[PDB]
Symmetry: D2
Subunit: 230 residues, 4 copies
Amino acid sequence: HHHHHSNSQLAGKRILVTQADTFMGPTLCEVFAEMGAEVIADNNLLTDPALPAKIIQQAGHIDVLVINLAIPAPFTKGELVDDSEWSATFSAVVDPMPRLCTAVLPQMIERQGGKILVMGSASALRGMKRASTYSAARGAQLSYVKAMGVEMAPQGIQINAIAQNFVDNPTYFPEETKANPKFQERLKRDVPLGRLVSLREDALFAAYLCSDAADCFVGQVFPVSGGWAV
Amino acid sequence: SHHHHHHSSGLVPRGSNSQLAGKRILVTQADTFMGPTLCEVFAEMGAEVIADNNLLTDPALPAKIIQQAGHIDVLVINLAIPAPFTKGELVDDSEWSATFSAVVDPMPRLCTAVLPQMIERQGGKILVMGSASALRGMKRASTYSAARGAQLSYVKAMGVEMAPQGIQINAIAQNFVDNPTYFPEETKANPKFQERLKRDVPLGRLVSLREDALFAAYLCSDAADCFVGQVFPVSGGWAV
Amino acid sequence: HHHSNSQLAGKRILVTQADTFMGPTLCEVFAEMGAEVIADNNLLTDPALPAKIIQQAGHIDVLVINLAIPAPFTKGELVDDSEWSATFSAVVDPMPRLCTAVLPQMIERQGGKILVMGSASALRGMKRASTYSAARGAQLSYVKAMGVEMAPQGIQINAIAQNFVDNPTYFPEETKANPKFQERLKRDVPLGRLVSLREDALFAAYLCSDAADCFVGQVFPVSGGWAV
Amino acid sequence: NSQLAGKRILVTQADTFMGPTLCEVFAEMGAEVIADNNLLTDPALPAKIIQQAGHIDVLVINLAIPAPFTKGELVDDSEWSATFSAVVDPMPRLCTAVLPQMIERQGGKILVMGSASALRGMKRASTYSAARGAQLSYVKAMGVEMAPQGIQINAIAQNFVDNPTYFPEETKANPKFQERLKRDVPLGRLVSLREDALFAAYLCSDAADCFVGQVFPVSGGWAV
């Protein structure tokens, strides 16, 4: 009858989040701020080769760089893919990554500390139909992280990736899809978890990897896909 | 009067609240391998820790330990004996039986004992404290590696099976964690060990007990309900 | 019914449970490629039996550890000690007994191969296969460790991790011919068909060949893309 | 023997990386080898090479430049562009050119000669690793997609093969190289060019029709 009516994990870290208005940008910016980060949100698509170095320059001190990069994944049949689709996908998802890392690494190497987290795709880990261009781009991200993480670990710098799929992302899982019983049957068959990973669950895992507790993780890819890929 | 105060006075540990508040967590072999650190870190995050110190070679014992605990939110399957260093061509039944009896056979007894209450309420977690020796081959570890592989494969199968019942079954696969049993002070004080460690382990240092336990604490939290049937290597990049 | 090729030339290959799982096809294909095949038919629950079999066979160039019982499909929460013990006794415990019996001659010669016929159930989780998967995982982790350990002695220890192989035990003709099974298979297995017994055995034969001396402590999924 | 009897196999950059060994061994196994020696940075060139060949049973995508050794924090756009232009971009140009004839007859194979640097992190190889990762993830996706049309697309992911580009006699003779190699490579020696090529030949055979979208590490246990 009484029952009717009756965080600082990232405190003081300056965290830059790229394409902060799309893919996992909104969830990361919201949850990182709840956990005490100073969030630097940038909304630019990074097709412009000059823009990453300007965004990093202008942000000043960066403790954590979150490389959140995306365009809507092409559905093109693998035998029909053209140079325009390949360049649009790699220009947006792949080419900006080293540009962001080479801009931010000097300050992290100077202070022997810093983190870079890539918000990547489990499409790079497990093959699926009609996603060949996006999968290839996403594989370039994961292999870059595995190599850079081994390389920068001795400098006190942690470079890791999430490899996500079946996250509650409105770009791919709009409410009318989620409400469809054929969708729910497919999801339960394909995803052991039996539901989408929440935006909050994804960002809280990201927040753990951006925390002092995760200093032991270097060059590691973490699948987040409800068991679709582990 | 203790010597750690000369240089380690006034230092706040890595990751220093209520992440496991109101969770009853049973830790097996709580006095060995990762047990002590897990019990300390879980209590620090607000868990009610049920610490069992028994070696579980007795087939009857797992069911009795689960039975006496009543409600268990999280079962942490921490099973270990000193890893045999035996050359592969010299392994015998006594070594194989000793290792599997301690590390492998208790695992399903514990899970079959605790799963009924978890199935009935559609909630619960089982975390296996496993070994990256099961992921990546090393010399003179064949028996221990095989036993640790049984754990990880059990987890991947059971986690898929129990996910639809609202239960998360996962594993850590650790190596190069600072367990003084395997990395004694006399080893750490040897420059060739430090030089070899930086060669073989991308992190360039041992993973701290605390770092490993903080990751286990995350996996035991509500935030980690999205993880089912997943193995998480914790080895400073030695295995990823 | 109702009432009733020199790829392996000059190699002695012992195949365990030669009448069972991949045994028959391995024996056929290895013989086709010039191997002298030692076909042993014993279930190896008896601890003394692997040393006897290896002793009696004499010179072994390749040991193929083919171990199987019908996989339990017991719900994970209902598994008992009898199931666990029967599965590990058959599929796991014999493996080191066979390897410790055969390795001395291979170490002496600085040459030899051990190939485990394992399961992709150890790589990818599936429902209602907990005991069998755990046992198969012991096999694959044993191979990875032993392969690293014995490589410097000039010995190659590897595994196949199969699933969705055209084994009539698990995939009867009548099931294969069912259109609902054909739909599920095309959904779950990229290959869109079962791997033939011969395809599996031919890959086993490649791993047992001199060309495969570069492979040590490696697991090779053979499941038509279900696990890679 | 005749493991590849009556197969037309097109090998790209047939003069570079694994090209020469693949051409020798495939012909040894009874293939009709179509050797093309071009660097494929020109976007127009893959379609022309496939068009001129007529029937292709197997396409071997052997793409390489010497791997940059640049420190990760010092990589610039020209290194990134040069590596992806040579190693990545030509890959789908080649596949989109050959796949129509394969889809039409419901048969054919595409094998990518890739790198285990995409699987396991190594220092001073960030650009090359990223490029090689694009190849392996392309293969996994394309292999699933094309398997139902009766086409097999797979990759080798190699390292520690006896390739004189990376392991010249001077390096191999250094006992400090021989010490490191035995530390880092379970096999305890380099994989031979012939071993690598015979494995590739197996994957181009009818017996390997069961393999779709699969990556095969070939690195003496360095990556498995």
